[PDB]
Write an enzyme that holds these catalytic residues in place. Sequence first.
Site, short mmCIF file in Angstrom:
data_model
loop_
_atom_site.label_atom_id
_atom_site.label_comp_id
_atom_site.label_asym_id
_atom_site.label_seq_id
_atom_site.Cartn_x
_atom_site.Cartn_y
_atom_site.Cartn_z
N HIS A 49 0.02 27.71 15.43
CA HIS A 49 1.03 27.48 14.42
C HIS A 49 1.84 28.75 14.08
O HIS A 49 2.65 28.72 13.14
CB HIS A 49 0.43 26.88 13.15
N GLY A 92 -1.77 36.07 5.69
CA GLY A 92 -1.63 37.01 6.77
C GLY A 92 -2.88 37.22 7.60
O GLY A 92 -2.81 37.94 8.61
N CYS A 135 -4.67 35.03 9.32
CA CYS A 135 -4.87 34.14 10.46
C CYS A 135 -4.83 34.91 11.77
O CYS A 135 -4.09 35.88 11.93
CB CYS A 135 -3.82 33.06 10.49
C1 LIG Z 1 -2.91 32.23 8.00
O1 LIG Z 1 -2.69 33.58 7.77
C2 LIG Z 1 -1.57 31.62 8.48
N1 LIG Z 1 -0.42 31.71 7.72
C3 LIG Z 1 0.67 31.02 8.40
C4 LIG Z 1 1.99 30.93 7.88
C5 LIG Z 1 2.97 30.25 8.61
C6 LIG Z 1 2.64 29.65 9.83
C7 LIG Z 1 1.34 29.75 10.33
C8 LIG Z 1 0.35 30.43 9.61
S1 LIG Z 1 -1.27 30.74 9.89
C9 LIG Z 1 -3.28 31.52 6.68
C10 LIG Z 1 -4.60 31.98 6.05
C11 LIG Z 1 -4.80 31.39 4.62
C12 LIG Z 1 -3.66 31.54 3.76
C13 LIG Z 1 -3.83 31.88 2.37
C14 LIG Z 1 -5.17 32.19 1.87
N2 LIG Z 1 -6.33 32.27 2.85
C15 LIG Z 1 -6.19 31.89 4.12
O2 LIG Z 1 -7.10 31.93 4.86
N3 LIG Z 1 -3.37 30.11 7.06
C16 LIG Z 1 -2.47 29.10 6.45
O3 LIG Z 1 -1.67 29.38 5.61
C17 LIG Z 1 -2.64 27.66 7.01
C18 LIG Z 1 -1.68 27.57 8.21
C19 LIG Z 1 -1.19 26.11 8.41
C20 LIG Z 1 -1.04 25.53 9.70
C21 LIG Z 1 -0.60 24.23 9.80
C22 LIG Z 1 -0.30 23.51 8.65
F1 LIG Z 1 0.16 22.23 8.76
C23 LIG Z 1 -0.45 24.06 7.40
C24 LIG Z 1 -0.90 25.39 7.28
C25 LIG Z 1 -1.10 26.06 5.93
N4 LIG Z 1 -2.37 26.73 5.95
C26 LIG Z 1 -3.45 26.59 4.96
O4 LIG Z 1 -4.45 27.24 5.14
C27 LIG Z 1 -3.26 25.63 3.79
N5 LIG Z 1 -4.51 24.93 3.75
C28 LIG Z 1 -4.55 23.56 4.19
O5 LIG Z 1 -3.57 23.00 4.56
C29 LIG Z 1 -5.92 22.89 4.15
F2 LIG Z 1 -5.79 21.59 4.50
F3 LIG Z 1 -6.71 23.57 5.04
F4 LIG Z 1 -6.45 23.00 2.91
C30 LIG Z 1 -2.90 26.35 2.49
C31 LIG Z 1 -2.75 25.32 1.36
C32 LIG Z 1 -1.54 27.03 2.70
C33 LIG Z 1 -3.94 27.41 2.15
#
Ligand SMILES: *[C@@](O)(c1nc2ccccc2s1)[C@H](C[C@@H]1CCCNC1=O)NC(=O)[C@@H]1Cc2ccc(F)cc2CN1C(=O)[C@@H](NC(=O)C(F)(F)F)C(C)(C)C
Lengths: 306, 306
Positions: free
Chosen positions: B41, B143, B145
Amino acid sequence: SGFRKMAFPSGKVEGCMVQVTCGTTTLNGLWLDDVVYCPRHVICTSEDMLNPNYEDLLIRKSNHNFLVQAGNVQLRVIGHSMQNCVLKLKVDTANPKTPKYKFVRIQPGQTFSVLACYNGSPSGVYQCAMRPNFTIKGSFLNGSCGSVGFNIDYDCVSFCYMHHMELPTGVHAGTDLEGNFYGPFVDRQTAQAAGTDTTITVNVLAWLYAAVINGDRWFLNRFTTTLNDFNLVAMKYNYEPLTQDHVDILGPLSAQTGIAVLDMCASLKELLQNGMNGRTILGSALLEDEFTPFDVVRQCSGVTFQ
Amino acid sequence: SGFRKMAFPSGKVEGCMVQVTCGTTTLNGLWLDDVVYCPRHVICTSEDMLNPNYEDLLIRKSNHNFLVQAGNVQLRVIGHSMQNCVLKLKVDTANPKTPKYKFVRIQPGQTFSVLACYNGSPSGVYQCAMRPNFTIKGSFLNGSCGSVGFNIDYDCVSFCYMHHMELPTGVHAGTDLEGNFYGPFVDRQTAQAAGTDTTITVNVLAWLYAAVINGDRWFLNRFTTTLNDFNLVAMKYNYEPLTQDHVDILGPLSAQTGIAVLDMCASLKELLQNGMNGRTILGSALLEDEFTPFDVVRQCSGVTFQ
Ligand SMILES: *[C@@](O)(c1nc2ccccc2s1)[C@H](C[C@@H]1CCCNC1=O)NC(=O)[C@@H]1Cc2ccc(F)cc2CN1C(=O)[C@@H](NC(=O)C(F)(F)F)C(C)(C)C
Ligand SMILES: *[C@@](O)(c1nc2ccccc2s1)[C@H](C[C@@H]1CCCNC1=O)NC(=O)[C@@H]1Cc2ccc(F)cc2CN1C(=O)[C@@H](NC(=O)C(F)(F)F)C(C)(C)C
Ligand code: NA
Ligand code: NA
């Protein structure tokens, strides 16, 4: 989210670890530029332990008595000197993996990462604190001596601990990287023991702020306290006195959360007096005191290291 | 003596961490030989989150859309492919710091070290376990991920986790290094939540053995139990069933301490039924379940890594 006992990445230190052997004694050394730092009692046999005269033992040694191995490479010792309880071996090769580094002597209550090593090879990394009684609650076996503790800031490795001894309670004593012991401990065989310890109040408060940042508030209350009345309670529970300096250092966490320091002190007072009532804070049923205010800011803000 | 939540030395992994940017999205990548592995993603914008068709998103991308940075060095992407939920970017340079490595998919209850990174730079290292509900209780911010989890055996790095998501309870979900999620989680925006979790019984038992090794026996008793009667109690306390396979794996610790596995089970039963009565085990007022039997043997025996 989340909050873990987080160590510094250890790669910069791993590249500095070597093995030092003197007769039948082998322990770890730290190779920085063309010097290897290790505990001076590498020159000791079992008989030279009651009251060893290290200066007398050392003058009787030759460079070729010291066998220094980095990986599969033997490094030739070309000079030596003793500094306090550390031996400095001048070697014929400068470590090409030497990081930016400094030597620091830390205060009790400060935390650092330990890279536990055996035979010059790293085994594991963990975080600990210098206790108020100048011991550390480490995890160290025979052969671990010369393992080091460190912090990293940006790209700079600050070495603060070298391991020397285990005390009868299973806790650990060692030196700064200039060979000065933390606490009253000595590298001779005597009846030394850890003194009574205390809990690191400023760190407990930092960790309560970490809990709030991470979404947990159950332990908060509406009350405030004076510094003096708090310290009257802390003293009863074998907590370190909280100074105005500690209050200032907690300023950023207090600002980030909107909870005044003395307000958090009133929460801690209530926790000391009433317990947790079966609840937990950040996964712990005890009050955690091995996170400094800086540790909390670093982990909740994502600071990195070049 | 001592017993700490010990992570693997992280240097071999640090040398593999890079930054991957796609438009406004930046996350971490793992650079092994001439391939960079990262969460797919990275190609997502905020709008492509409800039900993104990743194959459709990816065919619309060009190699020069991917900006890969290792330190101050830009690496040019020359090919790409998607494998499950991971993107594999072929780059023009092989990582000269590539360790011996493999990719492993672990079972729930196994532990590993996480190297938390931001913008391709390591922040910290900590140990965790794959929970029975296929989440991990990590410490991850925006950040993070693409940060990876790993074990080391001798000189071989076994990568087992790449970070993708945070769930509403503050725990974490991710994939193996071939892009398959642990658990039922998906990389699209839905109402996913952690399932009910259980305590990892075999690990609690391992940790009780660690406590005995380290000189603490207060929780032992004279009783034994059958596997079946123990599991009737474990089930009541939301503990994982203990299998005969778990019993065999605990054999070495049972032999080292002279305490039969089912005898230690009777101690655990008594602890579940009566609590700790204000006492602690290895510094904890809770029963710890993020040490495997192998973790205990490794830390109490001093195994190292080349
Ligand atoms: C990781 O750093 C990523 N950020 C992004 C931003 C844009 C594109 C791709 C990525 S990957 C974060 C880590 C996360 C964030 C904040 C706090 N602690 C963490 O570990 N991962 C995310 O933000 C993921 C990425 C994602 C991929 C596909 C989607 F359709 C939606 C997301 C949003 N996301 C989440 O972790 C969300 N959680 C959920 O959707 C769920 F179902 F797992 F709960 C969120 C609500 C943003 C924490
Ligand atoms: C370290 O690895 C060293 N071993 C040797 C062996 C020969 C010469 C020099 C050294 S340094 C160990 C680490 C230790 C051992 C076992 C378990 N956990 C550990 O952390 N350090 C020691 O064995 C030190 C070295 C020493 C130096 C001078 C002396 F006069 C006596 C010693 C013995 N020693 C101890 O730690 C002992 N503890 C104490 O004497 C005291 F006072 F601190 F409790 C011992 C009883 C051996 C644990
Ligand atoms: Na308050
Ligand atoms: Na028993």
